[PDB]
Amino acid sequence: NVIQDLYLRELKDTKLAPSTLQDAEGNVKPWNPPQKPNLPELELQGPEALKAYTEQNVETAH
Amino acid sequence: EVSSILEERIKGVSDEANLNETGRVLAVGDGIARVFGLNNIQAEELVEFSSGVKGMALNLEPGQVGIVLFGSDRLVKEGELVKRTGNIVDVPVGPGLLGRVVDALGNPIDGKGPIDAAGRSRAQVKAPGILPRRSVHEPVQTGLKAVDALVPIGRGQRELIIGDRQTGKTAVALDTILNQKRWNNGSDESKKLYCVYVAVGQKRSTVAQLVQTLEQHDAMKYSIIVAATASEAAPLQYLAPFTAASIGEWFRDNGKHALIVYDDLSKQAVAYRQLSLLLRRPPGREAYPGDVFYLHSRLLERAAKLSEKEGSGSLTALPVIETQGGDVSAYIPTNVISITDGQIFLEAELFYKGIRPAINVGLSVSRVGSAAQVKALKQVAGSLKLFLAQYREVAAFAQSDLDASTKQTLVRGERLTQLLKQNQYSPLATEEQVPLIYAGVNGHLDGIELSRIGEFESSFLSYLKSNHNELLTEIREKGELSKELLASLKSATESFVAT
Amino acid sequence: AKSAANKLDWAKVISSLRITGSTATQLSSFKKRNDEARRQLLELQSQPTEVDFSHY
Amino acid sequence: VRYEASLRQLEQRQLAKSVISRVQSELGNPKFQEKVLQQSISEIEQLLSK
Secondary structure, three states: OHHHHHHHHHHHHOOOOOOOHHHHHHOOOOOOOOOOOOOOOOOOOOOHHHHHHHHHOOOOOO | OHHHHHHHHHHOOOOOOOOOOOEEEEEEEOOEEEEEEOOOOOOOEEEEEOOOOEEEEEEEOOOOEEEEEOOOHHHOOOOOEEEEEEEEOEEEEOHHHOOOEEOOOOOEOOOOOOOOOOEEEEOOOOOOOOOOEOOOOOEEOOOOHHHHHHOOEEOOOOOOEEEEOOOOHHHHHHHHHHHHHHHHOOOOOOOOEOOEEEEEOOOHHHHHHHHHHHHHOOOOOOOOEEEEOOOOOHHHHHHHHHHHHHHHHHHHHHOOEOEEEEEOHHHHHHHHHHHHHHOOOOEOHHHOEOOHHHHHHHHHOOOOEEOOOOOOOEOEEOOEEEEHHHOOOOHHHHHHHHHOOEEOEEOHHHHHOOOOOOEOOOOOEEOOHHHOOOHHHHHOOHHHHHHHHHHHHOOHHHOOOOOHHHHHHHHHHHHHHHHOOOOOOOOOOHHHHHHHHHHHHOOHHHOOOHHHHHHHHHHHHHHHHHHOHHHHHHHHHHOOOOHHHHHHHHHHHHHHHHO | OHHHHHHHHHHHHHHHOOOOOOOOHHHHHHHHHHHHHHHHHHHHHOOOOOOOOOOO | OHHHHHHHHHHHHHHHHHHHHHHHHHOOOOHHHHHHHHHHHHHHHHHHOO
16 A cells, blocks of 8 residues: 555655766776786895805804 | 665665554653554564654553653654564674674664674573583683783683773773784684674774774674663663674574674663663562562573583673772672672773772682683693782781792882783784783792883793794694793793803 | 795794804794784785675 | 775765755655554554554
8 A cells, every 4th residue: 555655656756876886996996917026136146245255254163 | 886876776765565553652762752542563573663763662560551752752743653663683793794884773873884794683592501511622822921821711601801990991902802803813713703892882083993893803703792882872772782792693503603892881871771771670689670570580691601511602791890999799780790600800000000900919810711821821820829928928028127929029029020910912823822821920020120020021932933833833822831841931031041 | 734844944043043054044944934924814814805885 | 805894884875874864855845744543544443453
């Protein structure tokens, strides 16, 4: 009765208002890239280090 | 979408039928509407006003039935139909309530849609009897090192968390909830404690913080938080632990395990006072309602540990009581202390002195004690209780020319006390409680200076994980420390201390 | 696993006590231990690589 | 996901206040009179059915 009236009115006479996906973007965190592979670069290459180390600390094992 | 759901909802309300009993408010004042009518009204039955507020009818008086309004006074106004809902206060209960913040009535206040529930059960049902209950026998590891060693907490036995005002009492409790995640996540259904936290009289902002904190530690998925906030009307606040107990019953009856932490019963008391005094029921001691011992006793005894006849369920409980200025002689604390079966007494001085959790080792007691505590943890921390006892006694002697014996106690004692601190809002697995405590007990860390105790703790854990996570896994799973395991442990500690 | 390398390492650390030649050698072993301990907790922390297209 | 859910909530309250606007229209109509007749016969049907 009143149920029917409400049902009728609600469904028919107004529905969803406008709302854009674009506007949504502002309110969410957007995807961004995982920049950089982050290559490590070789350290201590060559016997330059070795000659340095042999000479530098001469402290013997006790 | 939302339009479809609304269309479903309008369709989902249907025309009513003739509704037995009616009242007309005789006078409504003070949130205590007194209605003339309601010829047959069951005591404590829920009655719904014309306005839309709900109430229960605590006093059935000889000529008027005194409804107590569950909302703002303004809603009801003198003379107006008072419909009889016809079901004594009951709240939806079920497995489905897991993960929803619901109010005292049971309505979803989390806003995550309708609460799917498997039964509605009354909110005043009497506690398990003499023959249904079988003695406590399953540890509940709260994950705080101090609680787990000093004051063991077992399944199905209420233990108070009585302490000084706003010394982060709630924090001690919340920690217990977090540790239950470890057992909970798995597949062993004789291990999952499904906790329900009952926030009574806490500001809505505080309960929002609670909700967020639980979500942050990914803990809502075994939590139900019945929240009746400070704003909510004094009847709702009154029925809030009682309602909560009913939520717990589904877990207990269906044979799960669960822990319901009533926080804080001190505010529960205040709400009962408000109802009783306003209903003009005779006043009593310290202006607290006359039967106040009876009210608290009803709530707290619904906790139990069911016998193997009755499905071996449990319903551990942990009421939190706020001690106003630490006066444990006060009427509301004293009543509760008697009712409970244990105490944890958080002391403000300790809190200030940087011991957080601030359990005062002396004034806490566990009355179910050694039934709880993992067998492993029991073995290597019987000593811990005794050592700390000496440290307390010899504490005041720390003001000169002191015996070597006295000095030995002091070194060991200071190091232990420092060791038992736990960083706030992080639980610690039982399998790492047994190793850490082992070190202090065996005196390995006596040598380590106080400032480095903290660093040592974290280091020991990493060292244990790298060097022998075999040892850790054995400790965890065997759950009992055999002499061979203790042997390996002694070695491990020796190695760790050496580095 | 990584623990095999480290079991030999720490056995060697307490042996390295018995050599006084060490200066920063023990600090180099300590460093390898640090980052080794970091990678295991990194690896244990690991999220599933992609979002669930089923649920999420 | 968070904003999507928020947008659904925003929709639910928006279409709710629009429903209130339709209600104010409904109570004006002499449907207000005609539905009393519907209620009259409904109560007749109901109370006799008891």
